[PDB]
Nucleic acid binder design. Structure first.
Ligand SMILES: *P(=O)(O)OC[C@@H]1O[C@H](n2cc(F)c(N)nc2=O)CS1
Ligand SMILES: [Mn+2]
Ligand code: NA
Ligand code: NA
Ligand code: NA
Ligand code: NA
Length: 296
DNA sequence: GTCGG
DNA sequence: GCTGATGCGC
DNA sequence: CCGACGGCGCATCAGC
């Protein structure tokens, strides 16, 4: 809301550091700064005022000054008009195209999605899938669809083996009314940290079998990443294709896993598996609290 | 780019 | 053919 | 001044 022009500017500069300059620590400096300014409850009137906040320093303060005087940054204006840099930044929006792959393409004169379409042969598997669903992957998912998606996953996991346990984590578990993707945690009593069968593959295969899963970006023994889609009517309009992650965790580390991927971000910082220690037994998420998703 | 040893 | 490094997403 | 700044699974590349 307040400082939005400032926060948009910073997030834009951040994206240029990451995607074009390949300077990841500066990308995080701009994001840290964008985040503290976003939570600052006043409208900022000067650089010096901003500078007081942790993560805002001399250079960001002078930039805030230029923006406040002119509504612009010479530097950002210039790079947006720049064909190379601007194209590199844009292509990274395609899932599977990082900063390195974006620069090689634009060096060969491949600058748009149309150019990408004409050169399928030059893309790897992840990248074709990302191109194909380019607009779908940017859409958010309504809760209502997430509940329908949840219904399909719990039903089908349970069909393969009733001893599986599955939990849809992320913001959704925290009760959020939209979500960026679907993250699912899976375990099975026979998979323990000190032990294993194709417990991921059988679940992925059942969901492909009923046409919930439509494509595969990556798939190993522990982690699957891919695309899914709700069924529609022949009459009604098609659902967008959605991202879905599935992680197989051992039973002991499960509730430690759930806790971690359920979050939120800020809440956790207050490990994933959990002066070297010795591994404590957990039958539930509350054993950890001992040693509620919604209010987070 | 910002922080802090 | 194998291992170790890098790119990528999150 | 000058180094830290996050870790991990999977796909794919570089190198032997
Ligand atoms: P995605 O569904 O965006 O995020 C869920 C989990 O959060 C963890 N996470 C996210 C992230 F963006 C970064 N950089 N690190 C990280 O550990 C793991 S996936
Ligand atoms: Mn997610
Ligand atoms: Na500051
Ligand atoms: Na990308
Ligand atoms: Na780049
Ligand atoms: Na995810």
């Amino acid at each position: 809301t307040l400082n939005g022009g400032i926060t948009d500017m910073l997030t834009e500069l951040a994206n240029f550091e990451k995607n074009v300059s390949q300077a990841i620590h500066k990308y995080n400096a701009y994001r840290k700064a964008a985040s503290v300014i976003a939570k600052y409850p006043h409208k900022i009137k000067s650089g010096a005022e901003a500078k007081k906040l942790p993560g805002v320093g001399t250079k960001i303060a002078e930039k805030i000054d230029e923006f406040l005087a002119t509504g612009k940054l010479r530097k950002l204006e210039k790079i947006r008009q720049d064909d190379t840099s601007s194209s590199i930044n844009f292509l990274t929006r395609v899932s599977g195209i990082g900063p390195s792959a974006a620069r090689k393409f634009v060096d060969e004169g491949i600058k748009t999605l149309e150019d990408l379409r004409k050169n399928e042969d030059k893309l790897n598997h992840h990248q074709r899938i990302g191109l194909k669903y380019f607009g779908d992957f940017e859409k958010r998912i309504p809760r209502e669809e997430m509940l329908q998606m949840q219904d399909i996953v719990l039903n089908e996991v349970k069909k393969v083996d009733s001893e599986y346990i599955a939990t849809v984590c992320g913001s959704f578990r925290r009760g959020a009314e939209s979500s960026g993707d679907m993250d699912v945690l899976l375990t099975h009593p026979s998979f323990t940290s000190e032990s294993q069968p194709k417990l991921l593959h059988q679940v992925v295969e059942q969901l492909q079998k009923v046409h919930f899963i439509t494509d595969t970006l990556s798939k190993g023994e522990t982690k699957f990443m891919g695309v899914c889609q709700l069924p529609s009517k022949n009459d009604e309009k098609e659902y967008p294709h959605r991202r879905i992650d599935i992680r197989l965790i051992p039973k002991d580390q499960y509730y430690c896993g759930v806790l971690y991927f359920t979050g939120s971000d800020i809440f956790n910082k207050n490990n994933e598996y959990t002066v070297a220690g010795e591994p404590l037994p957990v039958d539930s998420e509350k054993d950890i609290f001992d040693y509620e998703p919604k209010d987070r």
